[PDB]
Design a protein around this ligand. Structure first.
Ligand SMILES: Cn1nccc1Nc1nccc(-c2ccn([C@H](CO)c3ccc(Cl)c(F)c3)c(=O)c2)n1
Length: 348
């Protein structure tokens, strides 16, 4: 059937010549050749059925990506799984192959201001579409941004992503420990169940910083250190910013901390375009409600060369509570995953 570092990819005969790209807790991604369409593809093997969270993430990613269509968001081309649900252990998501990700590119190349600007434009062009659909991506970082050699960029991995119908108040109903640590907005630590899509803008800020310096701006060692790295640079929150924190436990936890001074952006990035540091500052703002939104970040002067509302799609049918109905046993989620992938099956 064809094996990569001990992982069977039951994808033949259509998909062959598999090479490792990466892996995660419950799956693996490889490049492959599509013999039918005569194109290179990526194939993400997911093995989620043992755990309810893994089934949730798999269902979310499939439900969201199949209803999305945008140049800066990876599409699903095809999905492979067993013809019976008892036989389904693995799901194979087939996507267009991208040459590399931003993480790899930043280990090996100092980016020109022109590249950084185009990349940031494309991230925010994609995020605009995502937010307009009422989705939070919730794990933006360099390794979830794919790059082909023409410097085209696509956001991938909607595993951590979800819908939040703005018709309903999601304070207290949102998963606690979201985003990769270095890219985690302060309100996930201080308002752990009440954050909004603004956490995505924070993540994009961390990425913009990382692009300027080839280094993570807030490389914290653990939960409480990440908040210290952040305050180490933004300086202690203002009194108006503290009074805005509704959780008492978390408000007092801050009021307890020593005072820190703001490090000026231009003293951390003395070579960077000033327009870029201005947008960085509006994106890395402590108070979520004051943090620039995706439309206003595109309209910033730094991206004036690319910003064009007439060529920037938004979701024509924004997602609603019908896409959030996934607080269910893993056996039930397995059924919904089977139903959602049915349309790729011979028959249906
Ligand atoms: C050549 N090259 N080098 C790096 C990336 C590529 N190309 C490529 N092309 C299409 C898709 C992907 C791709 C990668 C990573 N992920 C996430 C990791 O960020 C991922 C989540 C969960 C699990 Cl389990 C996983 F293995 C990988 C994708 O979803 C999808 N990559």
């Amino acid at each position: 059937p064809e094996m990569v570092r001990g992982q069977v990819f039951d994808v033949g005969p259509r998909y062959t010549n598999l090479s490792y790209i990466g892996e995660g807790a419950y799956g693996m991604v490889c490049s492959a050749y599509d013999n039918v369409n005569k194109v290179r593809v990526a194939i993400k093997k997911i093995s989620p059925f043992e755990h309810q969270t893994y089934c949730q993430r798999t269902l979310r990613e499939i439900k969201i990506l199949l209803r999305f269509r945008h140049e800066n968001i990876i599409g699903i081309n095809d999905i492979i799984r067993a013809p019976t649900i008892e036989q389904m252990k693995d799901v194979y998501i087939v996507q267009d192959l991208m040459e590399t990700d931003l993480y790899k590119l930043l280990k090996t190349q100092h980016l020109s201001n022109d590249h950084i600007c185009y990349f940031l434009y494309q991230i925010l062009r994609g995020l605009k579409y995502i937010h307009s659909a009422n989705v939070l991506h919730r794990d933006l970082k360099p390794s979830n941004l794919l790059l082909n050699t023409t410097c085209d960029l696509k956001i991938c991995d909607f595993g951590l992503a979800r819908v939040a119908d703005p018709d309903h108040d999601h304070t207290g109903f949102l998963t606690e420990y979201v985003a990769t640590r270095w890219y985690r907005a302060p309100e996930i630590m201080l308002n752990s169940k009440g954050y909004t899509k603004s956490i995505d803008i924070w993540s994009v800020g961390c990425i913009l910083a990382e692009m300027l310096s080839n280094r993570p701006i807030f490389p914290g060692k653990h939960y409480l250190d990440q908040l210290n790295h952040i305050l180490g640079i933004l300086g202690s929150p203002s009194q108006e910013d503290l009074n805005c924190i509704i959780n008492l436990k978390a408000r007092n936890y801050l009021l307890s901390l020593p005072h820190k001074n703001k490090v000026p952006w231009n003293r951390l990035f003395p070579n960077a375009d000033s327009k870029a540091l201005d947008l960085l500052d509006k994106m890395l703002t402590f108070n979520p409600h004051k943090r620039i939104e995706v439309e206003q970040a595109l309209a910033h002067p730094y991206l004036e060369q690319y910003y064009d509302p007439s060529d920037e799609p938004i979701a024509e049918a924004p997602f609603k509570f019908d896409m959030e109905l996934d607080d269910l046993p893993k056996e039930k989620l397995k059924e919904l995953i089977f139903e959602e992938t049915a349309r790729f099956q011979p028959g249906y």
